[PDB]
Write an enzyme that holds these catalytic residues in place. Structure first.
Site, short mmCIF file in Angstrom:
data_model
loop_
_atom_site.label_atom_id
_atom_site.label_comp_id
_atom_site.label_asym_id
_atom_site.label_seq_id
_atom_site.Cartn_x
_atom_site.Cartn_y
_atom_site.Cartn_z
N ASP A 35 0.92 -1.38 0.00
CA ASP A 35 0.00 0.00 0.14
C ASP A 35 0.74 1.20 -0.09
O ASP A 35 1.28 1.67 1.03
CB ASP A 35 -0.85 0.04 1.14
CG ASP A 35 -1.78 1.18 1.24
OD1 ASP A 35 -1.86 1.77 0.15
OD2 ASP A 35 -2.60 1.33 2.35
N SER A 199 -0.78 15.69 -11.91
CA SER A 199 -0.99 15.07 -13.33
C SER A 199 -1.15 16.57 -14.26
O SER A 199 -1.95 17.40 -13.85
CB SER A 199 -2.23 14.17 -13.57
OG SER A 199 -2.52 13.98 -14.92
#
Length: 330
Positions: A35, A199
């Site tokens: 994770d 992004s």
């Protein structure tokens, strides 16, 4: 040193991925959920409340000659999906894909929430976010990666998740045969303890690319792709019959649909998520309403590039003094 381990979907939907991990001496192999959105290595154990264990493999520290109680240490964690676990702490030898760390904090669960009990395939979590998020008290502990880093050939790990197929986590090297083209690297902020990056935009299907900054985290422990409501609405508007259902808890679509791809930007590069990766199947057995793999982050408080996004790429988690993230197509 290096390590290389195969990671395998837990079910037909890729809800999560498990990777075998050797703990203790002699080795006890547990299948852990790696994770990159958390920083605790915790396991089902011989100390876990018996009624809360249902099929998991447990770590038994009394059977490990290298286990030592970390006196006074406790831990307690709550995840974004509302699940939780807590317990005490041992140090022991932990190996992943041939890479060994001695003195790793292994957090033994005394209690786990129902979601963990009900998932027999996950024996615990191995956190790969920054150690500043580790919950052990009163002395915070380091992640497996943090402990291994100095010994690694290069201070990196990579995630290469499969779509309905196994994939790989590598530590200490970049497998140049595992991706196509070049890796595009992008800046990371560690201010929130996550692999947080921005992004450069998105496209839906064959549509034009929208240049827009989307701050989010690269999170292998989250199944879906969670993005701003504007972006998610633009995606689902291209699927006839798709709608947001408050009763179901997100966007659903007719199972008869062909889903468009979704592209996200990494610098001037583009990663394309095929439409099929966005199908999470019937909301309940036999239903013709299917659950979407792109969902709104509104009210999460953060955008999450979870498995839906990451499995479309070869992803480098560069833990150099100034960390960065790399993405390649594959």
């Amino acid at each position: 040193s290096t390590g290389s381990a195969t990671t395998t979907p837990i079910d037909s939907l890729d809800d999560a991925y498990i990777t075998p991990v050797q703990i203790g001496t002699p080795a006890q192999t547990l299948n852990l959920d790696f994770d990159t959105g958390s920083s605790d290595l915790w396991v089902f154990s011989s100390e876990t409340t018996a009624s809360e264990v249902d099929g998991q493999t447990i770590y038994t520290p009394s059977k490990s000659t290298t286990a030592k109680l970390l006196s006074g240490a406790t831990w307690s964690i709550s995840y974004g999906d509302g699940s939780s676990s807590s317990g005490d702490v041992y140090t022991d030898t932990v190996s992943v894909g041939g890479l060994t760390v001695t003195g790793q904090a292994v957090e033994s669960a005394k209690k786990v929430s129902s979601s963990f009990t009900e998932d027999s395939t996950i024996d615990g979590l191995l956190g790969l976010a920054f150690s500043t998020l580790n919950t052990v008290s009163p002395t915070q502990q380091k992640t497996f990666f943090d402990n291994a880093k100095a010994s690694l050939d290069s201070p990196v790990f990579t995630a290469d998740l499969g779509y309905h197929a196994p994939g790989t986590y590598n530590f200490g090297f970049i497998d140049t045969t595992a991706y196509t083209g070049s890796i595009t690297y992008t800046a990371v902020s560690t201010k929130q303890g996550f692999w947080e990056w921005t992004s450069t935009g998105y496209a839906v299907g064959s549509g034009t690319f929208k240049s827009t900054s989307i701050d989010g985290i690269a999170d292998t422990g989250t199944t879906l792709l969670y993005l701003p409501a504007t972006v998610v609405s633009a995606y689902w508007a291209q699927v006839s019959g798709a709608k947001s259902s408050s009763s179901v808890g997100g966007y659903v679509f007719p199972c008869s649909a062909t889903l468009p791809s979704f592209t996200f930007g990494v610098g001037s590069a583009r990663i394309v998520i095929p439409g099929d990766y966005i199908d999470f199947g019937p909301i309940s057995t036999g239903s013709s309403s299917c659950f979407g793999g792109i969902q709104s982050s509104a009210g999460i408080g953060i955008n999450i590039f979870g498995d839906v996004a990451l499995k479309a790429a070869f992803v480098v988690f560069n833990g150099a003094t100034t960390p960065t993230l790399g993405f390649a197509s594959k």
